[model samples]
Every structure is written in structure tokens, then in C-alpha cells.
Target: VETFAFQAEIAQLMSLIINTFYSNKEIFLRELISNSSDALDKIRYESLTDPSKLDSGKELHINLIPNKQDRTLTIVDTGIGMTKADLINNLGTIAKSGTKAFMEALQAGADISMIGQFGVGFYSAYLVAEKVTVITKHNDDEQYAWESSAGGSFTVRTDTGEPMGRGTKVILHLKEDQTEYLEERRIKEIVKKHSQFIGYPITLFVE
Candidate 1:
């Protein structure tokens, strides 16, 4: 559980999600689920080149876990997991954001796409977490763990657990201010609100 820092903008973005999105906290769940669905789509697309990554035995899905004792929330997904490089570039600053490129592609009539449009989706976890742990398994490599507290730096370590077949799991150590999110009804309501349209199913548990 060694904690690391986050990039400046990531820290700022977390505060933004916490402060500005307080009234719409459920949107964070939607954003995360949507991001997971996109990741699944990415793997599906890549599977075209190498079909071994597709595991039809497991349906693409996102799971939510609540730890009352720890006052934390976890969001786990079976999608294209991220590498350390992906985390640094995708979660830290605006380096990998496709916003600028999307705009350019849209203007050029190049069939604009929105995947990876905003890296802030991952950072939004910090809105609730005092710290976060991301466990991922990519088809191209072994499992890994990434931890951070959004203070402008982060730590990356190889995971000791068995490879997850394929996907990601993001655990959020919720702060006291977000304790209300631990309730089952509230979790369901939030999931239904923002993730019904997600490409994969979403499940919530109160353990």
C-alpha cells in the first residue's frame, strides 16, 4: 500500500470533480463505466488482429465493491488493462488527451472518434478516494499495480496476483466526505443513472 503522488493537473482535476461535480457525483460512475466499455471495445477491435485476447467465457462487465470498514469504493472491469506508460501518460497530464486531436480530425473530416478523449475519467476516482489502487492485466503483458494520491507523482509495481485473463480493477479509498456513496440504494441509483447505456453489464456488491 505504498502511496505515490499525482500530476498537478490530475490533482486539480480531482478537486474539480469533487467540488464542481458534487451535485452530480453519480456522473462519475457513468464516466467510469463508459470508459470501461470503451476499453472493451478497444480490445475487441484489437482482437481482430489477435483473437487470443477475447475470452467469451466472461462477459464484459464492471463490478462495484463497497468496504464499509475501510470507507472505500472499488470499480473493477474486464477490459483492456493499462500499462505503467499508459497510466503516466493517460492519468497524469493532458499529454494523451485526444480532445485537441479529435477537434482536428473532426475539422479534417477524418471520421472523428472520442475514445481516450479525456484522461480525467481515471482521476475522477480521487474525488472520493484519499488514495487509489489500480490493478490491471493487459493482453500484451503481465499484471501490474499502480497507486497514487493525486499529489503530482505515482508509484508503479508489478502485480503478484495471477493474470486477470484481461481487464482492469480500480479501487478507491473513499474519504469521510464521501461516505454517503457507500449505501446500496445510492449505488444502484447512480449505476442506473449513468451506466445503463454502457456496452457492458454493471454489478454492485455491498461487502
Candidate 2:
């Protein structure tokens, strides 16, 4: 695993958001699931222009697995996966100027639409997790894993596990104070409230 530090400004922004921005930690699930939906939308949209890129047998859906034994919650999506470089660029830094734009919009009048463009939603995973592991496979690149403790740095490497084929899986190691997220009922409610209307199927696995 190759470890790298977050850019100085990015590190400061992460700390600020994780420490003070979110009022409800449960929104973490909502944001992640929403991002997964966006990824699926991206691949679905691309398939229209290039049919060969579509995996005929793969169903488009999201899966949530809660493991009390491991003290973890995992969200998996059959969507556009990330290559190693994509993971680094997407997770390690703010790729677009949208972050500043979103902040500016929020300060002006709480423009809700800017949330998705900013791309900071992913970092919200840290609200309830001490560590996060992302395993993803893009049709164009090899499967890889990105792991971080939100300690101003992260590590990325080729995945040794079974190939994901074409998707992403995010595993969150829950913090002691955030175990409420591991509850089945709580997850179901969050999904229903925030993601039930999402275009694709979302399955919650309790066992």
C-alpha cells in the first residue's frame, strides 16, 4: 500500500467538515448512497453511447451489509468503479472548484443543489467511522483498495481479494460512539427516508 498525505488545504478542510459541518451524522449514509446512485447513473448514461461497456448480466443496485461481529457497515454498488488514479484524485483532493461554490451558495441562501457538485459528501463517512476501506474495479483499470483513517493521509493498492468485476464497495469501521448505525432498523429507516426513491434497487442485508 502506498501512503500519501492529503494536500495541506484539503487536510484542513476535512478536519473542519468532520469536526463542525454536519449536524446529523446519519446523513453520512444518505450522502454515500446518493453518490453510489450518481455513479450508477454515470455508467448507465455512458452505456447509451457505448453499449460494449455495459455488463449485460450485472444488475444495477446498491447493497448495505451490517456486521456486528466486525463492528462495520458496508455499502456496495454495482456502478461505475474507480481506478487507482481515480481513487487518489477523487478521495485525496477536491477535484472541482465546486466545493467553494457550494460553500458560497450555502452561505448565501442554503442552495441545496450544490451539495452533489462539491464532492465533499464522501468525507462525511468519517462522522461515524474511524477507518474506511474502498474496493473498486473499473472496466478500464485493475481492482484496487483505498484505505484511510481520516488522519490527513490515505493508502491505496491493488486489491488482493476477489475482483469486484465492475463496481465499488465501501467498508466503514464504526466508532464506539457511532454504533447506532449498525442497527438494522436504523439503517432501514435512513435508507427509506433518504434513498428509497433512488432509481435503482437498494437492498439491506441484516444477516
Candidate 3:
């Protein structure tokens, strides 16, 4: 497990969103689904330039798997996935000066949409989930699992779990009080409420 500490802004970003925005916690699903669709859009654009690129012939879709017994919500996307370094850089740090300004705005009561604009919206998963496991396979690199608790560090390692030919899978270990997210009806409602117009087909595999 090659563990890395979260960058300063990334740490500040997580705490700011998690603590300040719990009132709109259901929007975490909205942020995640919005993120999935963006990834799908990336692959769609990449596939056009190179006809035989990674997502060629892949079914561009997002699937939500809700497991009640274990209190987990799985979101799988067949999109432009990330290599190990991509995972590390993408999740571990905030890239631009915009990030500093973004946090200030958030601290000053900026709306939910502001975080998405800065791309730190991913950390909103910590709003309702205690842990996040990301398994991703990219055309440029081998598959890897990026796992992190609601802490200042995360680990990247070879994926020993299920095989994903391409794209990314995010499994959220829901906090006990947030089990409503694990319900089939609630998930469906949230998806429909927030992501009705996203191009990719978002399917829920409910159990």
C-alpha cells in the first residue's frame, strides 16, 4: 500500500464540504453522478480522435449497485479511466489558484454548484460515506485500487478484487446514519432528480 498524504487544500476542501454542507448531503449522489457523466464525456471525446482508443466499442454507461446488507453503494462507469498516477494526482491535490479562492467562497457560503466548478466536488463523498474505494483501469496503465478513509491520507495498490476491463468503479462504504442512500427507491429518486438529462444511460442494479 503506497500511501500518500492529502495535499493541504485537498484536506481543507474535504473538511469544508463535509462539515459545512451536510444539510444538502443528498447532493453527494448528485455530485458523484455528475462526475460519472463527465468522465463518460471525456472518453467520448477521446474515442472520436482515435478510433481505436480505450473506450472503443465500450458500452458508455453508468451503473449504480446498491447493497443494503453491507451498507455500500457502488457506482461503476465505463469512461475514460485513470492510471495510478492520475488517481494519485487527481484525488490527492487541487491544481490551480482557483482552489484557494474556491475554499474561501465555500467558507463564505457559496452554493453547492461552486464546488463542482472547482472540481473538488469529489470529496463530497465524505459527506455521507466514511470510506471510498476506487478501482480503475486505464488504457495507458494497469488497474489499481485507490482506497481512503475520511482522513488525511489514501493508499494506492494493485487491484486484487474483481476484474474491470476498462473505466472506473467507486464503492462507497456508507456511514451508519446515511443508510438511506443504500435504499433502492432513494437511489432511483436521486438519480432521476439530479441526472435525468445526462447522455449516458445510468442503470441501477438493485438488490
| lDDT, candidate 1, 1-207, per-residue tens | 344565454455445445543444555566567667877888777778877668632457778888899787878888878766676565323633444454465467632112235444555565567888888887667777888776566788888976677788887788887887889999888877666677677788866
Task: List TM-score per model, in order.
Answer: 0.77, 0.89, 0.92
Better of 2 and 3 by TM-score: 3
Q: Which stretches of candidate 1 lie over 4 Å from their true place?
A: 1-8, 15-21, 55-58, 91-119
lDDT of 1: 0.67
Model 2 TM: 0.89
RMSD, one per candidate, in order:
5.7, 2.5, 1.9
Order of all candidates by lDDT, from best down to worst? 2, 3, 1
Summed backbone clashes in each candidate are 6, 0, 0
How accurate locally is residue 156 in candidate 2, as Cα lDDT from 0 to 100?
94
Q: What digit string (tens of lDDT, one per residue) describes model 3 on residues 1-207?
A: 898987777776666666763477888888788788888888889888886776334688999998988889988998888888889896423544546878678679877566667776777788888899999988888889998885688899999887787888889999899999988888888888878888889888967
Tens-place lDDT digits, model 2, residues 10-113? 56555755676455778889889988998899889888898777763357889999999999999999898887888988653364455666667678876433
Clash pairs detected, candidate 3: none
